[PDB]
């Protein structure tokens, strides 16, 4: 159970490399007992450990214009509302009362949806670009 003992069984199974022993002993600590570890081909000569915290998933912004930190090339929203639509968004008809209510609140909004079609996306692009509501989809 101790970090040292785990680092040995790591080292032995690795065929006597202390680096992986330390690295795996570090990973096991930082991710916690319920955490998950994976291994993949790197690029540099060194081994490296990346730890992700909270929730992460492989979906990006639906348009570049949502980029509000173009120095980073990224979107960040603070205290955002989150709308969870288990559907296509196709018409702003669907959004109007929500966007007004979010606009009433003045907080930014993140949309996570099955899809956001050009009409809705374009309308969000105009309203976000012109600063009426901060929105990402």
């Amino acid at each position: 159970s101790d970090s040292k003992a785990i680092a040995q069984v790591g080292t032995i199974s690795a065929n006597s490399d202390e680096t992986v022993g330390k690295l795996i002993a570090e990973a096991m600590d930082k991710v916690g007992k319920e955490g998950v570890i994976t291994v993949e081909d790197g690029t540099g000569l060194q081994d490296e450990l990346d730890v992700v915290e909270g929730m992460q998933f492989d979906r990006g912004y639906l348009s570049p214009y949502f980029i509000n930190k173009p120095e980073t090339g990224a979107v960040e929203l603070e205290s955002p509302f989150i709308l969870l639509a288990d559907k296509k968004i196709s018409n702003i008809r669907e959004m109007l009362p929500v966007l007004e209510a979010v606009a009433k609140a003045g907080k930014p909004l993140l949309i996570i949806a099955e899809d956001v079609e050009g009409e809705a996306l374009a309308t969000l692009v105009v309203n976000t670009m012109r600063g009426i509501v901060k929105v990402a989809a």
Binding site: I92, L99, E119, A122, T123, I132
Partner: protein
Amino acid sequence: MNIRPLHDRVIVKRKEVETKSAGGIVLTGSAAAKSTRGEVLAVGNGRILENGEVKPLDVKVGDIVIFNDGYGVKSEKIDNEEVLIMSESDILAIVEA
């Protein structure tokens, strides 16, 4: 140029289209919406029907009205403005006050 609609015809111009303030807030994008509202520009001499005297149409110039913008409604270019031509029947209602 002024124009005289030759009885039952009415000439109007439509109000603003796709008002950029949906719910007073969201600057809506285009939705191919067209306003059913217009201003009465010219009114014909009256109604020729029934061999009665030509009774006038009840709308007058400067009336603001709701009209059915159907395929029967034509449109024309005058003084480079767009205008619309319709029967009295194609007008649905008058915008009062």
